[PDB]
Amino acid sequence: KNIDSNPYDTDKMAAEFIQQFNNQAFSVGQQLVFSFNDKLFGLLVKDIEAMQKIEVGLVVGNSQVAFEKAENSSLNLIGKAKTKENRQSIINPDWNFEKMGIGGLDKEFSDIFRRAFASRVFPPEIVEQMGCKHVKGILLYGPPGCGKTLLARQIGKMLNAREPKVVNGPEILNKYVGESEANIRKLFADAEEEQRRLGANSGLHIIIFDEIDAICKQRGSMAGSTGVHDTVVNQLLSKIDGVEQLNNILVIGMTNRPDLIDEALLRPGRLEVKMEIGLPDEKGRLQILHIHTARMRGHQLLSADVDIKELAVETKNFSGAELEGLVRAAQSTAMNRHIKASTKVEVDMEKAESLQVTRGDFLASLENDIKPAFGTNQEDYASYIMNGIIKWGDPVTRVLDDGELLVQQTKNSDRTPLVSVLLEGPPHSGKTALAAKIAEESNFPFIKICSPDKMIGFSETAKCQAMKKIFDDAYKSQLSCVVVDDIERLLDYVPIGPRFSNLVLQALLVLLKKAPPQGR
Amino acid sequence: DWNFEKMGIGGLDKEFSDIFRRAFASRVFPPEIVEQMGCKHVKGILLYGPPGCGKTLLARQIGKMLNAREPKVVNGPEILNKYVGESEANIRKLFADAEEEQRRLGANSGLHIIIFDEIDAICKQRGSMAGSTGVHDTVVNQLLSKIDGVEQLNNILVIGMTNRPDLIDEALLRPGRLEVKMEIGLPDEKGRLQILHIHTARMRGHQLLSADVDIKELAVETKNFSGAELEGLVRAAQSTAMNRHIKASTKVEVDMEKAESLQVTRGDFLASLENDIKPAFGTNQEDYASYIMNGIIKWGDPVTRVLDDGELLVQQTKNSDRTPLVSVLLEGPPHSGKTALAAKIAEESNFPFIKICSPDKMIGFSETAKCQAMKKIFDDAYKSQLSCVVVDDIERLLDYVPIGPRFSNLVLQALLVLLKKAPPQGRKLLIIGTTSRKDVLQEMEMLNAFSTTIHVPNIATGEQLLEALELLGNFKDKERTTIAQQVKGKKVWIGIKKLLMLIEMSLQMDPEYRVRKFLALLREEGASP
Amino acid sequence: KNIDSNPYDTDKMAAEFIQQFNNQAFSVGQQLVFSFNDKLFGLLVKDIEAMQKIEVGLVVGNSQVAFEKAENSSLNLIGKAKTKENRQSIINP
Amino acid sequence: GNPAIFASGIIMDSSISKQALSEIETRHSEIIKLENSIRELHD
Ligand SMILES: Nc1ncnc2c1ncn2[C@@H]1O[C@H](COP(=O)(O)OP(=O)(O)OP(=O)(O)O)[C@@H](O)[C@H]1O
Ligand SMILES: Nc1ncnc2c1ncn2[C@@H]1O[C@H](COP(=O)(O)OP(=O)(O)OP(=O)(O)O)[C@@H](O)[C@H]1O
Ligand SMILES: Nc1ncnc2c1ncn2[C@@H]1O[C@H](COP(=O)(O)OP(=O)(O)OP(=O)(O)O)[C@@H](O)[C@H]1O
Ligand SMILES: Nc1ncnc2c1ncn2[C@@H]1O[C@H](COP(=O)(O)OP(=O)(O)OP(=O)(O)O)[C@@H](O)[C@H]1O
């Protein structure tokens, strides 16, 4: 009934304990009641040591007592005589990495843990001798469906802190003056209050921004909404790091376009741990498939024919979401194979017991259902090669051999990371078919065709942006091959005049000699 | 009990001295003489500068330095409200205590501080044009009236901080309202040394810092680091060791036996420099590696000559006093490898600030965007004591094409104007520019702007080609001899960047056909000097 | 006061009940208190079957216990040692 | 689209009324008389 959070000086109460219980016998495990400043406390003897361990001893004037608060006790002890402060760890005792359910992101997690949590788990006393603040932010970016939100959620339920607040996109905007800023300010109030109350002992707080690029844009750039967005950005900047200091927060943001976010918001002392989540390699695919097919193996629902290594090999440039969808479709096929009710839903039982997902389901689903965004597409070749290839003379063989030589050079060289080639001839000679037969036999993990007939009626800027998008996508694979056909149609050339689009020509000329990032 | 070293601000001695002289000098002298002088007191301060240089820190420390009331703090647009006439009541509330204490205690009152953070959010210029009235001008009018109105106050002090000193209304900065303006900029070497000592004193106190760590080397090695970045460096260096003593991949555990020898060593600092912290007004080796992709090889005399002529220019811009702005143009035929040489010279300059403006990062931009981007890049170079800038492939920057001809006039005018604007007094700038068609620039009347020119040649003799091959080492002794007999009695016209590609193309054949294909390609390329 | 939604393994608590109350008399409708993992629960005897329904019996080591949460109770029972079952008829004839 | 718009003026509305207060006086008056009566009975 009399529990209070007010601090208690262990030194004064220890001196009072010595005064009251001098020349008195005490034994290990002895239970008693101590009155300090009219406050009653339950004391239990834990260990005794002669000035050697002794079960029973006599308290004397120079006896030393060290006090530690009981487990789950709200007692606030302050002093140096106390030895155990019972600082509750900031991590749930149950957690271990394997149960997180994330595969193919070992290095990134290692870096985040080192740079953001290393200082919240080392013994506090050592930390206090360095006088260092804690990091205050993390930023995540990458292509869609690679596992950002998953990591944010897993981190959120990592810690022993309270539940994390969530902001779903631009759910803070409002029409009346001075309402958005109020919504922004409402978020930090609990942290400010707890800080003021408890100082260094406050618990941790977490805030998660979703699609942060929809709110924080460079100041002075946009038009038509400069006032509102400027006010929001200024309010956020002031709150995160202002005149009054906070030391018990952590902010996580995630976006798809890391370039639009203001610059003053990404300096040390603010969101300063930037990470990139990219496509996985072979080991990552193997780990993800292992994670997503554990329960079935446990319950013996998985046939003995399936070999996970083969599936890992055969799926190239896949992303996590697609690896999940593949398994889901494979399971749905088997589940439907037993149910048989077109007229009215009618489940069976005889073979609803021996459910077995087989290799055939995996293959059939892989060839019909999933279509990776960065993979190779086959309908394109069907459309662009409508009557096959006819060997009517040596020149065909010559051209194909030259294409093969170029492909081999670009795959084995190191001093020439970029190559080019031009195919030309009289009209109605069939250049496009040959180009799309030299791309198909390339055997690269990424192929694409950029044809004018997908841009009918576009203006110059639209065409420029489309080509730029294609090349940006191509820049994210260990290999690639892009076909640009009918250049004159792209340029809108007409002999009268002459007339043409200068902007597209300049864009193409620049792009033709830009090297990709290192190693690709 | 105040003391300067307790403030913990390094590298800002002169600014603080001036602020103290102008603002607090008259509130400490004996009152009688001040009365005999009949002077009022300054009632304002404004601070501006690039992000992360130590404004808010200075404001907070000033707030702590005074034996006065507790300062009132305003966090950006914290006063706006939706009901008519409330956003001005909020303003008026701030001065009530000052007014009352003045009225009561006459000329013996205390001192009241007010701090505006991000002032430029609610104090923009008044439209002053009918129908273009700003969204909120009543706030500005109320503030102007309150700071200095019909009734007189003598016990206040207002401090403002901002990043854009160009948008604040001009009536708010006359010598009556906000009289002392300060620019907080990047520090020099001594400031960096002081900051590092300030942030490492505590660690050094408890023998947590190793012996091999020397501060002076770090100070020399970090060029154009803002204040916050040094702190970030130290923080990462600390975190590394603490991680070293934490095993956590299954269950977090903190070995407490080897955790009592914690000590920070230089290797941590080096790793942190390499990976974690990246400045904004400095430079990093990634760019040069991106441009100088295959190094530089001495295939003949001219190379050396070129480099020498660069060195001289650099020296001049460092020691000349009449000419604080020099420029040069590198030109030559295509595939002669000129941009690489410019990058090499710039890297060897050893200037603190090096930036490269290239068309590769402006694809699809409209001409206005190009103008603004170039303006920003140049402006960033006016805030240093030494700068070097490289303009790459001028012709691509203008969007030139022989037919017509057709080009962008606006960008050309921008450049022409921008090659003779001297920087703020006392600073030095160097500009290098690359191109591949001199004549066109000659017609546009552009060679007048530049101060000189340098010529980059091709390979033109068999001996040079053989030396280049030997340096690259692709072909061995017998093949080299065969090539010599085939080529030693002729003349050649080729560029290095083309030579590499020819070698790579040749290497793909079978072991016993490479030489013949290489020779065939070299013949077919054609000279046309 | 100590009501919580945390799951409770019916198997473990049934085994503990058998261990604690083996060779003890139990009658239909009997009310008692059971301590499981330092948590106090009210138990009411609803049915007794001989190893036939019987009014009173003796709980032995191999006696079987089936637990059902009280009406409107927030107790979260998990495991197979419970009579409650759920099946959704999301389709109709 | 439209910049943030100010809100309009407020028009409050008092509840109690003179005549309703005469009615409340009607309510209150009888209580004192009833009190006199009960005090008499107790006495
Ligand atoms: N590394 C991974 N290992 C295992 N499964 C993964 C991994 N990454 C993603 N997944 C699976 O794929 C899903 C991807 O959803 P998620 O929300 O993580 O993507 P996202 O990056 O948020 O997408 P977007 O950013 O486009 O909204 C996860 O819910 C999970 O099922
Ligand atoms: N050996 C071959 N080489 C090329 N095309 C062939 C050959 N045998 C059959 N074909 C067919 O000839 C047709 C050539 O049409 P294609 O569109 O490739 O020509 P094109 O040069 O693009 O035409 P245009 O110049 O009018 O744009 C295709 O249907 C192709 O499959
Ligand atoms: N001269 C300095 N000496 C010591 N520390 C400094 C100095 N300048 C900056 N710092 C460090 O920078 C930290 C943050 O700097 P500060 O709060 O001044 O940022 P700021 O300049 O207000 O940034 P912004 O422009 O975004 O408002 C300080 O807490 C301090 O550690
Ligand atoms: N001695 C050298 N001088 C210059 N470049 C060299 C030398 N030796 C090797 N190289 C390499 O040759 C290449 C020169 O290509 P670079 O881009 O500099 O040529 P460029 O003249 O800019 O091209 P273009 O005129 O077609 O735009 C680079 O990879 C460079 O590192």
> Could B363 and A507 be called an inter-chain contact, meaning their C-beta atoms sit closer than 8 Å?
yes
Task: Indicate the SS3 state at residue A7.
Answer: strand
3-state secondary structure of C6: coil
The structure was resolved to a resolution in Å of 3.4
The helix (H) or strand (E) run that includes residue A492 is: none
Helix (H) or strand (E) holding B73: strand B72-75
B222 Ramachandran zone, left/alpha/beta (phi>0; psi -120 to 50):
beta
d(Cα B268, Cα A439) in Å, to the nearest integer?
48
Contacts of A149 (CB under 8 A, 6+ apart): A210, A254
Instruction: List chain D residues with CB under 8 Å of A222.
Output: none
Q: Whole-angstrom Cα distance, residue A204 to residue A202?
A: 7
DSSP string, A21-90: TTT-EEETT-EEEEEETTEEEEEE----------SEEE--TT------PPTT---EEESSS--------S
Q: For chain D, how big is the Rg over CA atoms in Å?
A: 24
Please work out whether the CB of residue B336 comes within 6 Å of at least one atom of ligand 4. Answer: yes
Question: How far apart (Å, rounded) are the C-alpha atoms in residues B374 and B352?
Answer: 20
CA dihedral A191, A194, A196, A199 (to 10 degrees): -110
Structure tokens at A447: 């192929």
**Tokens at D21, concatenated:** 């207060």
For ligand 2, pick from A389, A434, A451 the residue to mutate: most ligand atoms within 8 Å of CB.
Answer: A389
Q: Which residue has the tokens 């300062």?
A: B71
Integer-rounded Cα radius of gyration of chain C: 15
Question: Measuring CA to CA, how many Å separate B299 from each of A484, B292, B495, B522, B528?
Answer: 38, 16, 12, 18, 22
- Which spans in A441-501 are helix H? 460-474, 487-491
C-beta of A385 in contact with ligand 2 (< 6 A): yes
Q: Is the CB of A164 under 6 A from ligand 1?
A: no
Q: How far apart are CA B395 and CA A385, in angstroms?
A: 40
Phi–psi pair at B118, nearest 5 degrees: 60, 60
For chain C, strand residue ranges (E) read 7-9, 24-27, 31-36, 39-44, 56-59, 76-78
As a whole number of angstroms, the distance between CA B42 and CA B177 comes to 8
Which residue type, as a one-letter code, is found at position A374? Answer: F
| Residues A47, A69 contacting (CB under 8 angstroms) | no
**Contact status, residue B355 vs residue B377, Cβ threshold 8 Å:** yes
Among B478, B400, B62, D42, residue whose Cα is nearest residue A243: B62
What DSSP character marks residue A262?
A: -
Residues of A in contact with D5 (CB under 8 A): 175-177
Cα(B372)–Cα(B379) distance, integer angstroms: 10
Catalytic residues of B: 338-339, 392-393, 420, 497
For chain D positions 6-35, those within 8 Å of chain A (CB to CB) are 6-7
Residue A216 CB coordination number (10 Å): 22
- Touching chains B and C? (3+ Cβ pairs < 8 A): no
The position carrying tokens 């976010």 is A261
Exposed (0-12), middle (13-18) or buried (19+): which is A232, by Cβ within 10 Å? buried
Residue from A150, A281, A327 whose mutation best tests the ligand 1 pocket (most atoms within 8 A of CB): A150
Asked if A471 contacts A431 with a C-beta cutoff of 8 angstroms, the reply is no
Question: CA B125 → CA A169, A233, A515, B45, distances in Å?
Answer: 32, 20, 46, 19
Q: Which amino acid is at D19?
A: Q
Cα angle B270, B276, B281 (rounded to 5 degrees) comes to 95
Residue B319 near residue B444 (C-beta atoms within 8 A): no
> CA of D14 to nearest chain B CA: how many angstroms apart?
21
3-state secondary structure string, B142-207?
Answer: HHHHHHCCCCCCCCEEEEEEECCCCCECHHHCCCCCCCEEEECCCCCHHHHHHHHHHHHHHHHHCC
Determine if residue B106 is left, alpha or beta; phi over 0 gives left, psi from -120 to 50 gives alpha, anything else beta.
left
- Closest alpha carbon to A312 in A293, A332, A287, A279: A287
C-alpha span between A351 and A355 (Å, rounded): 7
**Would you state the structure tokens that stand for residue B404, as one six-digit string?**
């017509």
Q: Cβ-count burial of A29 within 10 angstroms (0-12 exposed, 13-18 middle, 19+ buried)?
A: exposed
Atom of ligand 3 at shortest distance to CA of B53? 21
Task: Give the atom of ligand 2 at the shortest distance from the alpha carbon of A392.
Answer: 1
Residues 6+ apart with CB under 8 A from A80: A10, A11
Tell me, yes or no, if A175 comes closer than 8 A to chain D by beta carbon.
yes
In residues, how long is chain D?
A: 43
- Sort strands C24-27 and C56-59 into parallel, antiparallel or unpaired: antiparallel
Q: 3-class SS at B281?
A: coil
Is A239 in CB contact (< 8 Å) with chain B? yes
B371 to chain A, closest Cα gap in Å: 15
The encoded tokens of residue B325 equal: 């702005």
Q: What's B71's DSSP letter? A: P
Q: Whose CA is nearest to atom 17 of ligand 1?
A: A149
β-pair type (B45-48, B72-75): unpaired
Kindly state the tokens that stand for B447.
């060679």
| Inter-residue contact B502 to B525 (CB < 8 Å) | yes
Query: How are beta strands B112-117 and B72-75 bridged, if at all?
Result: parallel
Contacts of residue B201, Cβ cutoff 8 Å, sequence gap at least 6: none
Show residues of chain B in contact with A239, CB under 8 Å: 75
Smallest Cα distance from D11 to chain A, Å:
19
Nearest ligand 4 atom to alpha carbon B496: 12
Beta pairing, strands C39-44 & C31-36: antiparallel
Q: Bridge partners of A302?
A: A357
Contact A203, A161 (CB under 8 A): yes
The two three-digit tokens of residue A461, written as one number:
């800027």
Q: How many other β-carbons are positioned within 10 Å of the β-carbon of residue B237? A: 25
Backbone angles phi, psi at A43, to 5 degrees: -110, 135
Distance, CA of B2 to chain centre: 36
User: Which residue is closest to D5 within chain B, CA to CA?
Assistant: B82
Element (H, E) at B246: none
DSSP state at residue A442: G
Residue A498, preceding peptide bond in cis (omega within 30° of 0): yes
CB B303 near ligand 4, within 6 Å:
yes
Q: Cis omega before residue A124 (within 30°)?
A: no
| Pocket lining: A150 vs ligand 1, CB cutoff 6 Å | yes
Which amino acid residue places its CA nearest to atom 10 of ligand 2? A389
Q: Test A175 with D5 for CB contact under 8 angstroms.
A: yes
Method used to obtain the model: cryo-EM
Question: Is the CB of B339 within 6 Å of ligand 4?
Answer: yes
Contacts of B135 (CB under 8 A, 6+ apart): A227, D3, D4
Question: What SS3 class is residue A188?
Answer: helix
How many beta-carbon pairs under 8 angstroms link B with D? 11
Residue B360 in contact with residue A510, Cβ under 8 Å? yes
Q: How far is the CA of B229 from the centre of ligand 3 (A)?
A: 9
Interface of D with B in 2-41 (CB under 8 A): 3-4, 6-10
Helix (H, G, I), strand (E, B) or coil at A318: coil
> Which residues, other chains included, contact B32 with Cβ-Cβ below 8 Å and sequence gap of 6+?
none
Beta-carbon contacts of A449 under 8 Å, excluding residues fewer than 6 positions away, are A380, A384, A436, A439, A482, A483, A485
Quickly list H helices, A315-459. Answer: 320-338, 359-368, 379-384, 394-412, 431-438
Burial (CB < 10 A; 0-12, 13-18, 19+), residue B52, is buried
What does the CA dihedral B408, B409, B410, B414 come to, rounded to 10 degrees?
A: 110
The whole-angstrom separation of Cα A502 and Cα A460 is 9
Amino acid of residue C89:
S
- Asked if the C-beta of A228 comes within 8 angstroms of chain D's C-beta atoms, the answer is yes
Backbone phi and psi for residue A77, each to the nearest 5 degrees, phi listed first: -105, 135
- Indicate the burial class of B144 (C-beta count within 10 angstroms; 0-12, 13-18, 19 or more): middle
**Exposure string over A87-102, b if 16+ CB within 10 A, otherwise e:** eeeebeeebeeeebeb
Q: How many CB atoms lie within 10 A of CB A470?
A: 16
Is the CB of residue B396 less than 8 Å from the CB of residue B360? no
Q: From the CB of A212, is ligand 1 less than 6 Å away? A: no
**Gap between the terminal Cα atoms of chain A:** 69
State the helix-helix crossing angle for B462-472 and B496-507, rounded to 10 degrees: 60
Q: How far apart are CA C42 and CA A409, in angstroms?
A: 80
Cβ separation B399–A132 shorter than 8 A: no
| Largest interatomic CA distance in chain D | 79
- Decide: helix, strand or coil at residue A321: helix
d(CA B236, CA A133): 11
Angle at A426 between CA A424 and CA A432, to 5 degrees: 50
Q: Output phi, psi for C8, to 5 deg.
A: -125, 125
Please check whether residue A356 is in contact with residue A366, taking contact to mean a CB–CB distance below 8 angstroms. no
Phi and psi for B9 in degrees, rounded to 5? -120, 125
User: How far does the centroid of ligand 3 lie from the alpha carbon of residue A196, in Å?
Assistant: 23
Q: CB count, 10 Å around CB of B320?
A: 12
Strand A56-58 relative to strand A25-27, pairing: antiparallel
If residue D16 lies in a helix (H) or strand (E), which one and from where to where?
none
The residue among B170, B28, B145 whose CA lies nearest residue B91 is B145
Helix or strand holding residue B464 (H, E):
helix B462-472
Residues in chain C: 93
